[model samples]
Target chain A: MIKVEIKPSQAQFTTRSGVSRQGKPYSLNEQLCYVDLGNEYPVLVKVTLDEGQPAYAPGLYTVHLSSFKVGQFGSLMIDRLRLVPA
Target chain B: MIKVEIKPSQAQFTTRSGVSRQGKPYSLNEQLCYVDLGNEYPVLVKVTLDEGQPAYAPGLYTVHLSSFKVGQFGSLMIDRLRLVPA
Candidate 1:
């Protein structure tokens, strides 16, 4: 699951803004799979999603990073992310 | 704990590629951001960085929003993010 060209538009990112009134804050990272798909290997990433963005449960995703940064190399925008089904 | 003007140069995002030879995998989103700060509220946000970017740890960041997405709004590019002093 990922984006349009990527795949399914069913994924929910983490946030603490306006969610369920009876819920607690969750880390945005909770959205993406887990740490390991970073382009630079161990550069860590925090994927984002809109309020109305679809919601994809935990699974494998081949997200298409249109514009993303990595360490100092910075804002490494690209395409074609390998799938790592979790 | 943040960027330069934004704050510090210490913050580790999520990733699952590289780091320690004697380590396990991590998420990329674990890097720059968390969720909840959705423009429409409830949307999640993942921040990126570079290998040579820098090392910022723990703290709010007033990152410059060169580009970003907000639900259907989409790719809301801007600048001057809140100065979250983590």
Candidate 2:
């Protein structure tokens, strides 16, 4: 497990499209967090909630980098998103 | 926008595997919610939070049904997950 300190900015809420079985076009307004993983990672990793999950505010986090991908750096997933104590 | 009342049970937190850059096998212990979409829907919709998003507790919610898929009835997405007031 790669442990790193990250600071995530306030989420930028946006909308994306999806389709239904009956071809009804619908959109999901989602929030994506651009977290600075410091100079270690090349890009600002993007993160988002899976669904029905609670919201996390912009803050510092000590997280175990799990399920992370660099294909587009847009699907950064974490297991323990523990907020760093003040 | 389909307005409906839903009750999400206590999240069943579980682990799912993911691959890292070095083909390092890792797991993401995620939380999923089985929300009742009433009789109109055929099955219990599955929901989870995006990474960095806050946690939503088990309770009644007034949500706009968005980005829902029924292939496996597991990819349920919502825009406004407003809690139903007492």
Candidate 3:
């Protein structure tokens, strides 16, 4: 198994446009985080916070690398991931 | 352009185990919807609702098929999606 320690950082709020029920343009904001995987792959996982939820706290985590395809860096981008203690 | 009309259905709550701040196993429940794309692709987009948000109402939508890797069925799974009126 490709066990790597991850630290989420560089969080930014992202937004998208949507039409409201009254035909008005509205926007939804989501937090995006850049996760640093130490000493493993030379890539980072750009994870987005779940909608309507707070951003993920900075800490160690274990990511399941089965479905990591270099993009789709949002929440649950892969099948599974586990957050470890600090 | 690969334009497809989608209707989100089969709404279900999925759960995953996680350790809470108190070191107890707490599961996070998210709503998953299987979007029916009419006459476009044979595959359906299994999208999970954003955490802490209600399920997407039954309606039509336009899904931007970019970065759609047949998985990552969570919110913003693809680069963009637009919900159309009934």
Candidate 4:
């Protein structure tokens, strides 16, 4: 099985709207979010598809974060990103 | 340089306290959070140490998440994890 992880800067929501090939709204409801090592960061405001599931079709998938609002905190930033297989 | 990523469930901010080697408070201020592919999730609320920096010291670094509060959302969950070099 493969495992994937993603790290992001502080800030939660965004005004950006993202979609898939099906043109479906990929909602950031209870899905994307993470706890960094030591729980330093509450959640990585990004997405990581573990290699275990069929999340990706064994090909390159482009992840895009357009517009979104995180309250008065302003915009969000992505620190690091990667995918690994076990 | 290596890129590492972490994925987590939705929900930002946690009452959990994290620490580093210096016994310092690893504050989750503007450090951790992410933006997933399609912008579905606001952020992956987790930590991902890229292989490029001296973050891990080339050894096994155990990551632990004890307690934290994500507002009224209750608890936090870590979905996936991994490390890689490039």
**Top model number, TM-score:** 3
Q: What tier of docking accuracy does candidate 3 attain? A: incorrect
Which candidate ranks first by DockQ, i.e. highest? 4
Candidate 2 lDDT tens digits, A1-86 = 11223335443445578899999997554443333323344223333444444445564443322321112322222222223322
Residues B1-86 of candidate 2: C-alpha lDDT, one tens digit per residue: 11223335444545567799988986544443333322444234333344444445565444322321112322212222333322
Share of real contacts kept by model 3? Answer: 0.03
Q: What DockQ would you assign to candidate 4?
A: 0.07
Better of 1 and 3 by lDDT: 3
Q: Report the error of model 1 at residue A25, Å.
A: 17
Between candidates 2 and 4, name the one with more favorable DockQ.
4
Q: After superposition, how far is residue A50 of candidate 3 from its true place, in Å?
A: 32
Candidates ranked by lDDT, best first? 3, 2, 1, 4
Instruction: Name the lDDT value of residue A12 in candidate 2.
Output: 48
- For candidate 3, give the lDDT of residue A46: 39
lDDT of each: 0.36, 0.37, 0.40, 0.33
Chain B TM-score for the candidates in order: 0.32, 0.39, 0.39, 0.21
Model 2 deviation from the true structure expressed as Cα RMSD, one decimal place: 16.1
lDDT of 4 by residue, A1-86 (tens): 11223224322333345899988975332234443434444343344332333232232222222322233333332222333322
The residue-by-residue lDDT of candidate 1 on B1-86, one tens digit each, is: 11322224325445555566778654343343432322343222334443344434655444332322232322222222223333
Q: What is the number of backbone collisions in each predicted candidate, taken in the order shown? A: 67, 18, 0, 48
Q: Record all residue pairs in model 3 with backbone atoms less than 3 Å apart, i.e. clashing.
A: none
